[PDB]
């Protein structure tokens, strides 16, 4: 018996894709994998399923080779098995605030009768979800010259962003210092910073 290649794909939510691709590869209705708030380290993890109906020992080519930096696909090699479910891991790690888009082309060369399959991937990155408590710190009382006072305030980054950061103080007399000057938060990690005030101006 002679066989063809039919694109039978399943979303992460179990939504099937139309046989003999008519909705999967329509230019107006190209399936658009848009992402919810995704940060820069924990990639946008989505699973797509590709169905096989033959035992052919053939390879496949993923064109956009493979995308680097902002997109990662798992696995990248391996010839599938007959009647086996080929799961593909899509990882989206944006590099900037602007929302990124990528086009993935699955080249299939078995032979309308059938053409290459195209993927649209889009994902947005939140600029900063860093919150400070208290956003204003005041030293109640009268500090004499040469007297230092330190207070601890707590910062959390409710996002998947262990982004390094710097702490710059507008001080004309080196009155106020903060430790650490530089630091690396972790995803959803909350950090305690100490601010020291060594002022002496009347």
């Amino acid at each position: 018996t002679g066989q063809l290649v039919a694109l039978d794909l399943i979303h992460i939510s179990g939504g099937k894709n139309e046989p003999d691709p008519g909705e999967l590869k329509d230019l107006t209705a190209q399936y658009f994998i848009r992402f919810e708030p995704e940060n820069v380290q924990s990639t946008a993890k989505k699973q797509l399923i590709i169905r096989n109906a033959t035992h052919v020992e053939l390879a496949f080519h993923w064109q956009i080779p493979d995308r680097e930096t902002a997109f990662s696909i798992i696995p990248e090699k391996g010839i599938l098995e007959s009647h086996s479910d080929q799961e593909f891991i899509l990882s989206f790690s944006p590099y900037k605030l602007k929302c990124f888009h990528s086009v993935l082309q699955m080249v299939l060369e078995a032979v309308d009768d059938m053409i290459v399959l195209e993927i649209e991937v889009k994902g947005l990155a939140e600029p900063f979800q860093v919150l400070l408590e208290p956003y204003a710190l005041i030293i109640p009382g009268e500090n004499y010259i040469g007297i230092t006072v330190k207070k601890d305030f707590k910062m959390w980054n409710n996002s998947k962003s262990p982004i390094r950061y710097m702490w710059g103080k507008i001080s004309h007399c080196h009155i106020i210092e903060v430790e650490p000057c530089t630091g690396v938060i972790e995803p959803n990690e909350v950090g305690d910073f100490e601010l020291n005030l060594t002022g002496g101006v009347p």
Partner: protein, 69 residues
């Protein structure tokens, strides 16, 4: 407590303010768009003392001006 004054206690008040004209109004509904058509990312005219139920003002996470006393 004051680090220098014995027994004295200094009290500080923080209040967010308006970055621009106070007379710039804000509409009752920030958006009039159907809760689902958005692209996801009663009592009588009692002119008397009807309590203005100030909805706890949305917690301004880092407001741009803090009034201090």
């Amino acid at each position: 407590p004051v680090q220098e004054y014995p027994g004295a206690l200094s009290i500080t008040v923080l209040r967010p303010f308006h970055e621009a004209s106070q007379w710039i109004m804000k509409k009752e509904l920030d958006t009039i768009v159907p809760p689902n058509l958005q692209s996801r990312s009663w009592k009588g005219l009692s002119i008397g003392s009807k309590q203005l139920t100030n909805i706890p003002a949305p917690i301004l996470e880092g407001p741009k001006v803090l009034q201090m006393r």
